Design a binder for this molecule. Sequence first.
Ligand code: XP3
Ligand code: XP3
Ligand code: XP3
Ligand code: XP3
Ligand code: XP3
Ligand code: XP3
Lengths: 188, 187, 183, 183, 189, 182
Amino acid sequence: VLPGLNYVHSGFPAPGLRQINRHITGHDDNGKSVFLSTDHGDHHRIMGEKQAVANILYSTQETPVQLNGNVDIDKAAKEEPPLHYHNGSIVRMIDFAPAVESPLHRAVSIDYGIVVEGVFKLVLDSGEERIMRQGDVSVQRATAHKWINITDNGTAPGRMMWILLDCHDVVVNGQVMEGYLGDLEKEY
Amino acid sequence: VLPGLNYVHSGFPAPGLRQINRHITGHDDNGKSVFLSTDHGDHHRIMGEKQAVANILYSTQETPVQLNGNVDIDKAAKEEPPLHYHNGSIVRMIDFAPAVESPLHRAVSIDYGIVVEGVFKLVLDSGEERIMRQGDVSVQRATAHKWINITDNGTAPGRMMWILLDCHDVVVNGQVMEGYLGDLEKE
Amino acid sequence: VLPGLNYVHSGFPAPGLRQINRHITGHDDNGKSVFLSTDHGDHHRIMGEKQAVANILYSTQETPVQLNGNVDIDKAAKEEPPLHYHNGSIVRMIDFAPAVESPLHRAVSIDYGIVVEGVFKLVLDSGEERIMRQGDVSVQRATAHKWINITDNGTAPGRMMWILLDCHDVVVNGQVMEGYLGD
Amino acid sequence: VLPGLNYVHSGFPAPGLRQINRHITGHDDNGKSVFLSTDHGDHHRIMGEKQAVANILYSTQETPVQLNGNVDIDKAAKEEPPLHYHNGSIVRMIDFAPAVESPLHRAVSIDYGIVVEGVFKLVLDSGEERIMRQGDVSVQRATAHKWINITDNGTAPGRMMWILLDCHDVVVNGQVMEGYLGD
Amino acid sequence: VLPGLNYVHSGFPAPGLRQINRHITGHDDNGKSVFLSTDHGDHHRIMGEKQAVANILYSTQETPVQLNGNVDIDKAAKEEPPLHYHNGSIVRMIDFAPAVESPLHRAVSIDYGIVVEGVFKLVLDSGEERIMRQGDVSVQRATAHKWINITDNGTAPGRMMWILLDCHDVVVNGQVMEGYLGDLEKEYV
Amino acid sequence: LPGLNYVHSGFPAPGLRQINRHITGHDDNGKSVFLSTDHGDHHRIMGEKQAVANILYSTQETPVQLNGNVDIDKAAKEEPPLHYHNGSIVRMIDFAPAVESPLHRAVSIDYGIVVEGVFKLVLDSGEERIMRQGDVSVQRATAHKWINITDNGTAPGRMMWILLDCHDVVVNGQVMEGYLGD
Ligand SMILES: CCCCC/C=C/CCC1=C(CO)C(=O)C[C@H](O)C1
Ligand SMILES: CCCCC/C=C/CCC1=C(CO)C(=O)C[C@H](O)C1
Ligand SMILES: CCCCC/C=C/CCC1=C(CO)C(=O)C[C@H](O)C1
Ligand SMILES: CCCCC/C=C/CCC1=C(CO)C(=O)C[C@H](O)C1
Ligand SMILES: CCCCC/C=C/CCC1=C(CO)C(=O)C[C@H](O)C1
Ligand SMILES: CCCCC/C=C/CCC1=C(CO)C(=O)C[C@H](O)C1
């Protein structure tokens, strides 16, 4: 039984989760701060067999970010970003179908995760786990892990948001803790 | 009357909002990914006359982040960070007392904001405004703004979270959009 | 300023409201009861200046309903139904942007209404109103009314669902109380 | 042990579920649309061993509905409706005790079902199943099915509302698919 | 416009609020602890113009409480208690209609109050007030006050629960602060 | 061990809300005023940081003596015991996920209410009731156990009890002794 098979029938948002507002601010040609856009995000991507859907709220590709001439807006909207940006950031929102889990994987990045809706289980390759509820926050420091949606005993959708930042490779007594995607390669 | 006067009586979390779990992962001596800590955050800071309380969930001070030797954990924990870090990041969570307002201010940083609980109004120096509900997200590109907690017609606490990154100066018509701390009294 | 102007930026569902599952059941080759579809509904229509959006979950066009050959499914999906079907039914679900209100209007129709999310004010042409919270049910008997979304003091979206049934013209004191769209 | 045995101890609403407001509209002497009554429904019926309770919010016995002289109101109030009315409608709300389920059964009618509170499992005789959460909607086309309250892993009450309409009987392979009451 | 007029049309619970379970425990003749009842409370009383309904979850009439022969159970069930029992307790739960307000009154009693549902404003005769949300608790020490249901800008019902205990008369400057009920007097006659 | 080290910052437990406790009083002009707004009193970690209690008030005589604010002083000065003879205790407890109390009996009558979550109340006869938010229990000196079953043992829960003094429960000439249990 593939969990969440064909659950996400209408892209973002997944059934049972809320449509959002993303607001981007900026300056007009008089120097006044205004809103530039209100929308549903960007670069929506179905994951698995309609088991999840990702939503890229923003991205940057250099540090510090260049805002003049609105080049960061164009850069974020021009291309769908990869897993993570070197010297940059990605804000990726993913809706989980009931009981959907990620593969055990490692990205070489530092990730700030917050539970937007539902209950998620964060399982590391050691077997240690934490149950994260709405509002709880994780700082994933380039560790091998998998995310499991356990909301309402596996009957409810859930939503996570991650902010992915660039980090150097993790080295433990000579050896690189190399990145691997498992089955998440298909989505990127 | 000043809103939220003496409302936050026991730091974080503000009365009416939930205590949190912050989980930090890392590697043990065998290269296994483990949980290093589970706590309530860090560098709690009362704001105003007990009108709000901030919670620094993490911070970084270089790009890319250096993680080996747990150097990033030490830097985040040994100093209270400033408003924002150059070439770095700050995850700042803030509990608002009912009807509490930020000053009209500008930080020279790009901020990813999300409403964790409640309803907030984002007003910009042009007078343009958006009402942001739980789960809504704003991308603040070094703009002058204020945050207004309006939850339950101004009778309920609210919680925001921001991730502040470093950004270059914004130059409009050859003039720098200089950052400024506000003053609510003069408004 | 117009309430909820440009609020509904991505059709159904409105921002702050949940996507739905509509399940339609049927019969297979050997008479076993199965599921024929799971979807977001049908015939989504923006209303006003992106101030609301309707979703037609189902409709029938005769009484009693004819299910054989799945022709009822065909009738429901092949054309967008009108406001109200004669000798039939319409399941119309509508997401309201914050503080968006309906025009005072009358349809020759008996309406089963349920608040799916939010707080609504039902106002009749006499001035009488009832505030309806989530799960409350109204039976509109061809009366003239307007629906006002008041969720969270006019700052939150709301969702109503109606089932509209055909009724005979209502006569009060020898006068037929006529339908009107208002706007 | 029977699920939800004696759980419903004071009729409608079941413990843990909210009392409702049912509003009925009508016309007064001068043709003004007014509210006629606000109540808790009608024809409350305990089901099983106090394992559930049904609330009939409205019914009609003819299409189109006759509303003049409030005869539809008097008919809806005068007698407890049956499972479903020929050429008519029934608004039937039911509170489920924790873990309670219906018998596998078939009514020859087309039902619109919406989850009012809780989480329900809709199992068909083929074994196919869908989980329906709050606001999810089902169109039951005279199929054989079970309703199972699974709210909070079988420890919480749940509420469903159905609008049952008359339908012609479903014929498969030349065989009348006969409605049965199960248990 | 009188707030909450005719809102409570079916007693307890008020429309928009949940029906409750009240479990009472006891002993059988073998010393085993058993459940004696599960119900909707006791002594339901509509208040005002069907603007509120009260639900007496329990009461006691002596201290310490006598439980043998289940006599405490029968004393609580056989009679609707007054506002307050000398040397005893009352658990009073009250459903408010939208925007419904109690009169300014004083009970010579120490009351433990908890907001079960909604948002309430506790106003004392000094003009001071506190907004109490769900889970918030007050300890009312024979003070003059009123309760205001302000849930959802005055359009939603709310529920409070109180545990009233007996207290001595509060004297301030050799003058007893006398209890008074105002329009609440019609509700306990 | 359920909830081991879950309560990492005292009251409130992670996932549960901070409270306001308001105590009213009298002016020197006889005016009813607010004397304090706080987070309760006498917080106590229980188990291996598996639960935390919060004492909202307590009284030590019946009827209660409010003059001179002596009731406030007595409630604040010392942490109360399990229950007070001739008096009351308002005890709020946050439970970590899946945490259960021991099977035990106190010689008191307890008014319980679920503030948040889902709790199973188990009596020594094996009889149980699942109590949800808003449900109330009248514990008449019975041997019992409380189990936090919120969201299948994965969420915290909160109960509040008002404990009152009762006489010994004698069944067939034998006193039903209290015990703390294991
Ligand atoms: C097909 C089944 C799984 C689909 C959903 C996967 C989500 C979690 C994986 C993940 C992503 C997305 O690739 C990140 O962006 C980094 C973050 O830490 C974890
Ligand atoms: C006493 C009144 C002020 C307290 C209310 C909250 C203010 C939020 C201001 C803010 C901060 C904190 O300095 C940021 O980190 C950036 C973010 O956009 C707005
Ligand atoms: C842009 C502002 C107008 C749109 C807001 C929603 C209006 C609902 C009107 C309605 C319909 C749809 O036409 C029905 O299905 C009958 C039911 O009584 C009320
Ligand atoms: C003893 C426990 C079972 C009884 C409780 C609920 C059963 C609902 C069955 C049902 C009815 C009831 O008449 C309908 O009206 C059609 C609708 O599809 C399902
Ligand atoms: C019809 C207007 C009033 C309806 C709402 C009811 C409020 C009662 C307030 C109250 C009472 C009554 O005396 C108590 O039971 C003690 C406690 O302190 C507050
Ligand atoms: C092993 C970690 C702690 C387990 C959870 C604690 C339960 C509270 C026990 C209790 C008390 C205080 O001992 C009361 O106030 C009476 C009420 O019935 C149950």
